[PDB]
């Protein structure tokens, strides 16, 4: 999200360059039911309620570099030989050790 | 050299400025050492 608040896809290189966290917004469908002991029930559902952002492992199914051909990766300034499997957290490539 | 009465702290010494210096951070905002903050608390309660 830019300063003006305009959302835009975040490329992994931009996260690396601008020291961003490669995170995906997380939404959850929430159903709220209220009973006021008046033999009436009101059920209101808030579709896609923002609840946080999950850091995304690069070159995973939820990464923007998913299914992109090697030529496409080069267009994004990404090394095709790069295996992915890490996170960009404040621009730092973080690997989770088993 | 030592007396039992002297063990009781009737008068509290104040370390010199060399022992506890005035660190400078974020410009001219003098960052007082932890001792000064305790010394500031000591004097406040002592005056009260």
């Amino acid at each position: 999200w830019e300063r003006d608040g305009a959302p835009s896809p975040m490329m992994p290189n931009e996260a690396r360059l601008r020291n961003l966290t490669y995170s995906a917004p997380l939404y959850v469908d929430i159903t709220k039911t209220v009973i006021k002991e008046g033999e009436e029930q009101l059920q209101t559902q808030h579709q896609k309620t923002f609840i946080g952002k999950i850091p995304i492992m690069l070159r995973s199914t939820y990464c923007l570099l998913n299914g992109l051909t090697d030529r496409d990766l080069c267009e994004l300034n990404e090394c095709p030989l790069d295996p992915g499997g890490y996170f960009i957290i404040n621009g730092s490539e973080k690997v989770l050790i088993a | 050299y030592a007396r039992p009465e002297w063990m009781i702290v009737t008068v509290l010494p104040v370390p010199p400025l060399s022992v506890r210096p005035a660190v400078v951070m974020q410009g001219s905002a003098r960052n007082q050492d932890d001792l000064t903050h305790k010394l500031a608390d000591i004097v406040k309660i002592n005056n009260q």
Binding site: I30, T49, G52, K53, L96, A98 | -
Partner: protein
């Protein structure tokens, strides 16, 4: 071997429990006050992020 997934799933439940605890606390204040609560405002997004 706890890989990234299971390790992350370990964090999410702790962080999701805090999220659910937080909305419970936020809602309890408004319900006790007598006024309904806004769900969007009850959720603290910084907990998971």
């Amino acid at each position: 071997l706890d890989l990234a997934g299971p390790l992350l799933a370990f964090l999410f439940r702790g962080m999701f429990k805090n999220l659910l605890k937080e909305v419970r606390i936020y809602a309890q204040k408004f319900i006790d006050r007598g006024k309904d609560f806004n769900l969007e405002l009850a959720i603290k997004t910084r907990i998971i992020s």
